[PDB]
Every structure is written in C-alpha cells, then in structure tokens.
Design a protein around this ligand. Sequence first.
Ligand SMILES: CN(C(=O)c1ccc(O)cc1O)c1ccc(C(N)=O)cc1
Ligand SMILES: [Cl-]
Length: 209
Amino acid sequence: EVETFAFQAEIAQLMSLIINTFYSNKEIFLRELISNSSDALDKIRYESLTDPSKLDSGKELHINLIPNKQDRTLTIVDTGIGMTKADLINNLGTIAKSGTKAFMEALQAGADISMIGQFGVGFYSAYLVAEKVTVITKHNDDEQYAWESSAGGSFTVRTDTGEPMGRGTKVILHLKEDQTEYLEERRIKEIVKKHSQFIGYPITLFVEK
Ligand SMILES: CN(C(=O)c1ccc(O)cc1O)c1ccc(C(N)=O)cc1
Ligand SMILES: [Cl-]
C-alpha cells in the first residue's frame, strides 16, 4: 500500500536549503504554487482544444484556496492536467536536478530564494511554510495518488482512497506552528493581489465557519 522513496541527493539539498536558510520573504510560496496550478491548467486547456473529451473529467478550469485553522492546513486545489504516478515520483513533473543546479549557482551569484520559480522548482518553496506537504493528484491517464513528504530525505506515494478529485492537483500545506498567518483571509488576499494578480483562471478563497 505505501511506497517510500529517497529524494535524489540534489533535491534533498534543495529542500534543506529552503528549510534551513534565514529568509524572511516566505509569502512567495503561494505565488509559486499558484503559478504551477496555472501552468497545469494551461496544459489541459491546450490538450482540450483538439480533444474536448479531455474535459470529460471536469470542464471548469480554476484554483481554490482553502484554509482550515482546525487542521492548520492551507490547501491549493486546481483542476489542471494532474500528474501520473511516474511524474509524481519524478519530482512532481519538474526537471528538478538541473533546476536545482542552476538555482544554487544563482544564489552563489547573488540571487535570492524568491527567484526559485525561475529555475523550475517552485513547488519546493512550500517548505518555507509547511512542515509536511501532501499532494493528491489525478491525471486522465491514471488513478488518484497521494504523495507526501516532511522532508528528511524521503517521500511516500500511495493510491488515494480519499475524496475523488475528477482531475487536477491538490497541495495540502500542513503549516509550521509559527506560519499560521497564511490561514488568515486578509493575509491570503493580500498575497494573491500582490503576486498573482494576472493569473488567467479564477482563484476562489474559501472562508471558514
Ligand atoms: C502537472 N503539474 C501539476 O499537476 C501540479 C504540480 C504542482 C502544483 O503545485 C500544482 C500542480 O497542478 C505540474 C507540474 C509541474 C509544473 C511546473 N510549473 O513546473 C506545473 C504543474
Ligand atoms: Cl533535470
């Protein structure tokens, strides 16, 4: 039922750098994850232009932001193309080994952590704010999978028996205890307006009871 994998050494080092570096501008995680969602939504849109049946798993293309203060989670849900099991295991669809090389050279040559997305590895910015990240994904060509990692050099993959998603990717951020500002409506709104104001899909911020 649960498979445990080692990160490639370069990815483990990327994650360690994100977790251990003193860097105050953590809010950029949300821009990076919304960017990934937008890119996934563009991919299923483009495939649907020539094969409308690709949207049989859901026609609506959008992004939901779901804070839950009871669970201390921020969830980013998109209805994009989703990931196969293979692409989950292969660094969540990224060229993360080569991207990490380029990013670490850029940080040595004066870049900062906010530029992570320019190297194709923006997903890993989740670990600025999350102690654990859970990714639930569903691609038309595959079953629904759950990826998870608390860093420390490993991740797990299992077939997800949870709530069916139709198609797309859900990133569940289990926030660090000192990062609960990212569950507050006003703070999320501020970050979306500051860094994600030109994303071409609706971004709905859910509210809480
Ligand atoms: C397919 N795919 C996803 O399903 C996906 C991965 C991570 C994420 O936070 C959101 C996603 O939709 C995904 C993978 C990689 C990128 C990227 N921009 O490098 C974008 C999208
Ligand atoms: Cl690569």
